[PDB]
Symmetry: D2
Subunit: 385 residues, 4 copies
């Protein structure tokens, strides 16, 4: 199960570069040079890396210091064949964003956040990125009076509309992806799920330029079904990017390696992405636990790609099995794909076999046979077939 | 704190009429005649009642039996002044809906569900309802292979589009409201939150005819902030109806009386509905606990309306307090309402005070003073002011 | 992966016999005769069955009707070789238990509950049971004033002490196992976790006669780690019985077939039970989904035993792998098993290498190498080794 | 509602001294001198303060530096009348504790943790503390193979037994209190609830020396009823200390000011502590949100004490109301306090009115009248009585 750049696996600089600070503990690992991360990831078989502006260029850097951080990075990209398909803005670490970037109560902070964002869009375009992600981690509140949510959504729409106007006036080939999260670090975060972000996008001036960047663990922090949520995104034509990791239920954001946490949900997600032919990057937003040294950091990153490839094999075998294909027919998945009333409204109203003469007791007595189907999926997942 | 029909309080027949069957226990109360429920609710000061088709007309009734169930009901409505502002369809109790109504895998069940729905829309229009609610409680799955969610959303859109075509071809003055729920009775339910339902509506052929009917307890079953969710609905112009009750965290759907469960969230919800001038009915979808006899049933219903009126008083006092109005200015809620960049994009890009000359350390040092504000809200809620 | 009675798999009559009533829906399956259940389970390879009194003998039966229900049951047990290792009391379905059995506010209900329990202990002893389970599903409250919890724990201790006095005065060879659950059907249930039940047992007059009967899904309804909880039970010498099923997170009690829900936790549980040599029955308390007919009922029951046997194979292979045994040494699991200070207190206080001369920076820099270990467990679970 | 030292309100140095670092953000406030904290808290009306060793004495301090940190602190205590009733050990911040203190896999780390603990017990005794708290925040695991829980509980018992032997051999007047937490910062923490800690204590060599220190928010992170849990602690005679704060459901540990979060649960907790006459300190373990400057820090601390005093007034009024006292009799809370069978086992078995002649249908028909009672509690809480 060896990865190749063909598999389009990408990692953020901040993932393998996490030093291990949590709310109760100091760093257990030293800082990584972004040059060494690109090199070690290329040897593992990754396709590319992503960054926040402040991961690559330390906050407060002069214009010359900015120049050589970028130029060393580009040299490592050139030396390895590594791509940069996505980039994003840090609007959550500096104390100035403690009440938000785009929806901070202070007007002057909001304007700053937009200028800080615009500056990095230019850089992402320079480096070849096709997707620009926005994670509004500080947008929200800990108490009810602190934030009028309707005014906040007006400010959030204003910010995204202005960014839309910037990229089209520049002629940039880049699209935006909103990344939802229900809570942490704020008590409640605005646009808390994939659904809320999808609904919000339809009110932007140019909705074609915006999609979603869902994260496995984030929807699971609301106890939601992540494959179900991704299906609704694909059904709406809005899955621009995806963040893969593991999470063990409703609690703090664990960011475990992909495959850890809810293993069956990982299997159903891989099944769905491969079946629908999602062609974007398979991006890992995870943290190697702070119990680990650097050897365990690279072992954990290798594990992300390895688990994806195993699940892909098992899901392909599941769908290719003639016995599963007949069970799907037994469960009437073929009938679900057929229109309910292609004959139209008047014909349905005139169809006595749909009501007056419909035999409800016979239909009710039919088994769905879902449990035999699900055990075939288990058997395939576990390799007992 | 006496309710009057002016306050527009409504109750479902199935709420005060719940006999107390739960997954582990038999009924503790006998069945209510819908005639007696309308009478006892009118004396409590309610404005109206709502129904499922099968609450009013027992399933399998002939056309004559249907005729006198409706006619006795209309007589009680006439005798009391009680309204019927909403009605809905039972697509979840009969065994034939065990895999869903609109998205059942079996095509013939889907057609039946649509004919059963259409028949009750006619009746709701006859009785004066202006909102028709759809709660797809059986739409979803317990296992991943049982339901292809993209096909299911195609079937769900087909059903809602057909209902849209029916009411406009008839010239009916009625609009639809989708009621989300994340789980129970299925393992995962489709459109699990207000956000998912809002996003789905924008893909219907006639989106103006559809809104949402959120329930307090349902969003809290996903650990979400219910007032935040209602604000996004109002911001989108889609709050057609609301269901009020109480819930104690992430667990089974408790349906407690309104005010119970998360009391502070109830206060912030009432604040929001009154401040935005929501003019629809204040509908209670709750269950009197099965510990109670009929005297405790009516005591619990009285409690719903009473708690709403107390919270309304405390929230009005909060907003009218000159000391709270100055704290809101201290927290810069006035600045949140002002546009970030009414001067436009080019001016923002040319504004050095928004980046090059912006003093981030001074802005960061400013306190938001949210905790003083929130304690004023506490003091007002508890009546220590 | 064929089960044999050697594997000691048992099922409750109420599991395969569940008719499919949930809070929103009528039964989808007809009632099973307990005679046919014993026969179909024996052919699947089960070892035995368990019962509530009211599963076997319909409530309100005369003494003659009781006589032939038992006698038909015993004949089926004799015809199949099926055992009855556990039995329990229904103190939750009849309306008289709406506020509890052992801790009902009404004294006369509490006395009835004890007499109903005592009568079935006699029967369980007659049928050969060695464990008597108590699940206090109605013990608890929906509101804070309804139940003084200290008085309730006095009443709960009084009941269990009296049952203890009954079995020892009769000379019965039977022990009790308390089954915790955090909520549902009450808003909060007393003794909500394995921990609370373990602490309670130490205050009974004869603590040696009582242990716990934990359920997979119940601890997961509080977001807890079920293998961790079972380890604490084994460490205290109190794992008398276990209930196996699946559950998908914090929500209503799903009672899915074992292996479904959190698959990795099922693997770690099987690892622990086999490694510690737990010799009690492997009991399944599950519900075949109401989507299923009777063929899917037996398919789901077969699935429980099948998944246990696969996980047992994978866990044995994990522990037998020489490469995993060296990784465990790399992670210092051997050092965890060694005493911290067998040399005693004074020697530890006199040991400068434990404080004054301890090099904290060197110790901190050591990797735990937990992520390489965990991926070996993944590889073994998935059969990629 | 003015606090006085009579009310016995205490605060940790780390609470008002929190600088505002969270997993995604840098500090927003500067460090407090412990001298200024004691002074500002005394003026607010607090009774005392608590500390971790490393809050008071920076890690790595020499023996002289230790001498004047303590001596400046004692001078501020003397200047204000402030007490120090509790102290505890930091076994979670330094990287050396990344896999735990008492249950780290490395033996030499475990020995260090015990020596670091013993050193601070001596200091707490010197400063007058009567309770020593242990919060094992790093004890646990992120993956199943990393920690054998039975070996870990052997190591945890060994550590607590050794500390027990140390204080009794020294003749110290101090007792220990274990503080449970279900998760964060580890994926799962050992002894995750009040119940698990209570059960563990009964296996220590000298169980009389150990109790529990429960935290509001920690039990709510498992969705549990905190007043119920405190009742079981009081029933076992083990409530040695309590930590008060607010929390909004199952998510990260919010540590909000007391009264925030679940307000009704705060009311029922205050009712219980005052009714049972708990005489220990009312300790606040909270964090002023990082949105705040220092004026909002002291406003938030004032809010903790203020909300406690308001709830105490409302709960006293509730219990003193003659109409609530008669409702309690209506709900048969008086009967719950009476023994079920003081007449003994044989008399209960001979009592036909407890089974053969018991009229179950009459008993079942009685209403519990819990909803009228609970609305009286609401009315009293909100000051509408
Ligand atoms: Mg995350
Ligand atoms: Mg992410
Ligand atoms: Mg509900
Ligand atoms: Mg509802
Ligand atoms: Mg269960
Ligand atoms: Mg069970
Ligand atoms: Mg805490
Ligand atoms: Mg604490």
């Amino acid at each position: 199960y060896q990865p190749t750049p063909e598999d389009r696996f990408t990692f953020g600089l901040w993932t393998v570069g996490w030093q291990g600070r949590d709310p109760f503990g100091d760093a257990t690992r030293r800082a990584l040079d972004p040059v060494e991360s690109v090199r070690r990831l290329a040897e593992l078989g990754a396709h590319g890396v992503t960054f926040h502006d402040d991961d690559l260029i330390p906050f407060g850097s002069s214009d010359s210091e900015r120049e050589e951080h970028v130029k060393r990075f580009r040299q490592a990209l050139d030396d390895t064949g590594m791509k940069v398909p996505m980039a994003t803005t840090n609007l959550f670490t500096h104390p100035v964003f403690k009440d938000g970037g785009f929806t901070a109560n202070d007007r002057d902070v909001r304007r700053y956040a937009l200028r800080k964002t615009i500056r990095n869009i230019d850089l992402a375009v320079e480096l070849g990125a096709e997707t620009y992600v926005a994670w509004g981690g500080r947008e929200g509140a800990e108490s009810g009076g602190a934030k009028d949510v309707r005014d906040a959504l007006d400010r959030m729409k204003e910010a995204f509309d202005l960014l839309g106007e910037y990229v089209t006036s520049q002629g940039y080939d880049i699209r935006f992806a909103i990344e939802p999260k229900p809570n942490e670090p704020r008590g409640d975060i605005l646009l808390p799920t994939v659904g809320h972000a999808l609904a919000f996008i339809e009110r932007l001036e140019r909705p074609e330029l915006y999609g979603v960047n869902p994260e496995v663990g984030h929807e699971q922090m609301a106890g939601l079904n992540f494959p179900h949520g991704i299906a609704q995104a694909l059904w709406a034509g809005k899955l621009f990017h995806i963040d893969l990791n593991g999470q063990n239920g409703i609690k703090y954001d664990q960011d475990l390696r992909f495959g850890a946490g809810d293993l069956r949900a990982a299997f159903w997600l891989v099944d769905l992405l491969e079946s629908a032919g999602y062609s974007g990057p398979r991006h890992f937003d995870f943290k190697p636990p702070r119990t680990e040294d650097f050897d365990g950091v690279w072992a954990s990153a290798a594990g992300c790609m390895r688990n994806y490839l195993i699940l892909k094999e098992r899901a392909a075998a599941f769908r290719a099995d003639p016995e599963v294909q007949e069970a799907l027919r037994a469960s009437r998945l073929d009938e679900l794909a057929r229109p309910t009333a292609a004959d139209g409204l008047q014909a349905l109203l005139d169809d006595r076999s749909a009501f007056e003469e419909f035999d409800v007791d016979a239909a009710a007595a039919r088994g769905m046979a879902f449990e035999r189907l699900d055990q075939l999926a288990m058997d395939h997942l576990l390799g007992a077939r």
